[PDB]
Design a binder for this molecule. Structure first.
Ligand code: VBC
Length: 242
């Protein structure tokens, strides 16, 4: 079942922004959101696409393991952390587009299209350039669709090996302490309106898992920190985390 809690709208408006948070209680099989309509509106996945892209690259052998070094191509880019060697873990962490563009070129259109359909991922449409379609092509995914996809990943139910799924979930590790573990991926879509930020993943507790997917308007890069901050305020409000 699904519940709309418009009280969460405060967390967005108080920061002069608009967006949606979608939560899914795995034990109770219940979903919650501030905005049922936007929860089902499809956006460019941008760097959240690094989750499916990593899975496909690993399963096809494009990426051997999480230690394989992807050498910087020597082209200076405006993101300092991109101008260095990466492995899967650091490429995820710093959302290093050029590494994942190379993955996609090696995957190829045919295998990428087939795998996204097998994942039931978004609109499954890779129209555009194979090395940028998640940034300015035809692929779209909603917040509820991100949840559906992440739940399959959590349970190792995607049509790739258990190993590929374990490795990607390792690479998704974002935060861990004595109270919870967050595995997630940020996204930042600027090439097509509306510009949005994403944060999708889940929170692991001792006896339950809460999946989450949020997006919010992002007119400038100055509000990027609000993706995680707003999500955590909701989690705190719902007493999912202290
Ligand atoms: N102008 C600009 C600012 C920041 C970025 C950037 C880099 C790396 C990661 C992320 C993110 O998804 O949080 C965003 C990219 C362009």
């Amino acid at each position: 079942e699904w519940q709309e809690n418009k009280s969460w709208n405060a967390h967005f408006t108080e920061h002069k922004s608009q967006g949606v948070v979608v939560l899914w209680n795995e034990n109770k099989q219940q979903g919650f959101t501030n905005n049922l309509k936007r929860a089902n509106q499809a956006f460019l996945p941008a760097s959240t696409f690094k989750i499916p892209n990593s899975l496909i690259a690993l399963d096809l052998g494009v990426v051997k393991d999480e230690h394989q070094v992807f050498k910087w191509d020597g082209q200076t880019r405006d993101i300092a952390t991109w101008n260095r060697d990466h492995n899967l873990i650091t490429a995820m962490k710093y959302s290093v587009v050029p590494v994942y563009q190379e993955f996609a070129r090696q995957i190829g259109e045919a295998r990428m299209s087939k795998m996204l359909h097998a994942f039931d991922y978004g609109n499954e449409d890779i129209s555009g350039n194979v090395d940028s379609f998640w940034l300015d092509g035809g692929i779209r995914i909603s917040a509820t669709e991100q949840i559906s996809f992440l739940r399959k990943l959590y349970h190792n139910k995607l049509h790739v090996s258990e190993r590929s799924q374990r490795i990607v979930k390792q690479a998704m590790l974002t935060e861990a302490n004595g109270d919870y573990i967050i595995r997630a991926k940020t996204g930042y879509s600027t090439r097509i309106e509306p510009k949005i930020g994403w944060w999708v993943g889940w929170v692991e507790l001792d006896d339950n898992v809460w999946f989450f997917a949020m997006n919010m308007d992002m007119p400038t890069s100055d509000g990027l920190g609000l993706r995680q901050a707003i999500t955590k305020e909701v989690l705190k409000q719902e007493k999912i985390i202290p």
